[PDB]
CSV table of C-alpha atoms in Angstrom, one decimal:
chain,number,residue,atom,x,y,z
E,1252,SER,CA,0.1,-0.1,0.0
E,1253,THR,CA,1.4,3.3,-0.9
E,1254,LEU,CA,-0.6,5.1,2.1
E,1255,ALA,CA,0.9,2.4,4.2
E,1256,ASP,CA,4.4,2.8,2.9
E,1257,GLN,CA,4.0,6.5,3.6
E,1258,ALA,CA,3.0,5.7,7.3
E,1259,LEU,CA,6.1,3.7,7.6
E,1260,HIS,CA,8.4,6.4,6.6
E,1261,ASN,CA,6.9,9.3,8.3
E,1262,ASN,CA,9.2,11.4,10.1
E,1263,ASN,CA,6.6,11.7,12.9
E,1264,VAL,CA,5.8,8.3,14.7
E,1265,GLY,CA,3.1,7.0,16.7
E,1266,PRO,CA,-0.3,5.5,17.2
E,1267,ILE,CA,-3.5,6.6,16.1
E,1268,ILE,CA,-6.0,5.3,18.4
E,1269,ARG,CA,-9.9,4.7,17.8
E,1270,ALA,CA,-12.0,7.2,19.8
E,1271,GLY,CA,-12.9,6.0,23.4
E,1272,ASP,CA,-11.4,5.4,26.7
E,1273,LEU,CA,-7.9,4.9,25.9
E,1274,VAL,CA,-7.2,8.3,24.0
E,1275,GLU,CA,-6.5,10.3,27.2
E,1276,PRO,CA,-4.5,7.7,29.1
E,1277,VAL,CA,-2.2,7.3,25.8
E,1278,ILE,CA,-1.7,10.9,25.5
E,1279,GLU,CA,-0.8,11.2,29.0
E,1280,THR,CA,1.6,8.3,28.6
E,1281,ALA,CA,3.1,9.7,25.6
E,1282,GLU,CA,4.1,12.5,27.9
E,1283,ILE,CA,5.1,10.8,30.9
E,1284,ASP,CA,7.2,8.1,29.2
E,1285,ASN,CA,8.6,10.5,26.7
E,1286,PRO,CA,9.5,13.3,29.0
E,1287,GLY,CA,10.7,16.7,27.3
E,1288,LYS,CA,10.0,15.6,23.9
E,1289,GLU,CA,7.7,17.5,21.5
E,1290,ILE,CA,4.3,15.6,21.2
E,1291,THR,CA,1.5,16.3,18.6
E,1292,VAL,CA,-2.1,15.4,18.9
E,1293,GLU,CA,-4.8,15.7,16.4
E,1294,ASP,CA,-8.4,14.7,17.4
E,1295,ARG,CA,-10.6,13.7,14.6
E,1296,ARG,CA,-13.4,12.1,16.6
E,1297,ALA,CA,-13.2,8.6,14.9
E,1298,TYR,CA,-9.4,8.5,16.1
E,1299,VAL,CA,-6.9,10.5,17.6
E,1300,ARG,CA,-3.2,10.6,16.2
E,1301,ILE,CA,-0.5,10.8,18.6
E,1302,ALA,CA,3.1,11.4,17.5
E,1303,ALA,CA,6.7,12.5,17.9
E,1304,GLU,CA,9.9,13.1,16.0
E,1305,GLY,CA,12.1,9.9,16.0
E,1306,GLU,CA,10.4,7.8,18.4
E,1307,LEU,CA,7.6,7.4,20.9
E,1308,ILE,CA,7.5,4.8,23.8
E,1309,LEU,CA,4.3,3.9,25.8
E,1310,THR,CA,5.0,1.4,28.6
E,1311,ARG,CA,2.2,-1.0,30.1
E,1312,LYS,CA,3.0,0.3,33.4
E,1313,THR,CA,2.3,4.1,33.0
E,1314,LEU,CA,-1.0,3.0,31.2
E,1315,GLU,CA,-2.2,1.2,34.1
E,1316,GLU,CA,-1.6,4.2,36.6
E,1317,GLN,CA,-3.4,6.2,34.1
E,1318,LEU,CA,-6.4,3.8,33.5
E,1319,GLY,CA,-6.4,2.8,37.2
E,1320,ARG,CA,-7.5,-0.7,36.3
E,1321,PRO,CA,-5.5,-3.8,35.1
E,1322,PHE,CA,-4.0,-3.4,31.6
E,1323,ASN,CA,-2.4,-5.7,28.9
E,1324,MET,CA,-0.6,-4.2,25.8
E,1325,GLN,CA,-2.9,-6.1,23.6
E,1326,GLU,CA,-5.5,-3.8,24.5
E,1327,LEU,CA,-3.5,-0.9,23.3
E,1328,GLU,CA,-2.6,-2.8,20.0
E,1329,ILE,CA,-5.8,-4.0,19.5
E,1330,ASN,CA,-7.2,-0.5,19.6
E,1331,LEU,CA,-4.5,0.9,16.9
E,1332,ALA,CA,-6.5,2.4,14.0
E,1333,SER,CA,-3.1,2.9,12.4
E,1334,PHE,CA,0.0,4.0,13.3
E,1335,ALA,CA,3.3,5.7,11.7
E,1336,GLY,CA,6.8,4.6,12.0
E,1337,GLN,CA,8.0,1.1,12.7
E,1338,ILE,CA,7.2,-1.0,15.9
E,1339,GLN,CA,9.2,-2.9,18.6
E,1340,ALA,CA,6.7,-4.5,20.9
E,1341,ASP,CA,6.5,-6.8,24.0
E,1342,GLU,CA,4.6,-7.5,27.2
E,1343,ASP,CA,5.8,-4.3,28.7
E,1344,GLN,CA,5.9,-1.6,26.0
E,1345,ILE,CA,5.6,-0.5,22.6
E,1346,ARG,CA,8.0,1.5,20.8
E,1347,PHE,CA,7.0,3.3,17.5
E,1348,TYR,CA,10.3,4.5,15.6
E,1349,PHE,CA,11.6,6.0,12.6
E,1350,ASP,CA,12.9,4.0,9.5
E,1351,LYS,CA,16.5,4.9,8.6
E,1352,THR,CA,16.3,2.8,5.3
């Protein structure tokens, strides 16, 4: 996909989240676990795009404090309308990051 390849190579990386109870926790978490970095947020109602330059991390840990109920990363991942950049993901966090190739 041309559009998906553009998403791959975007300078600005991060999740696009379906509208719902996860948007606010994920914005908070983008700020807390990426301290001091410039973050961009765009609300289109159906979904919200959160991005930063180079890399963006969201830890399972931070998301749980922010939801204040039990949290598995699956629940972020299954609620990703899309995303920009590449992904490294595990049981504790997801990293969106820029593609150097």
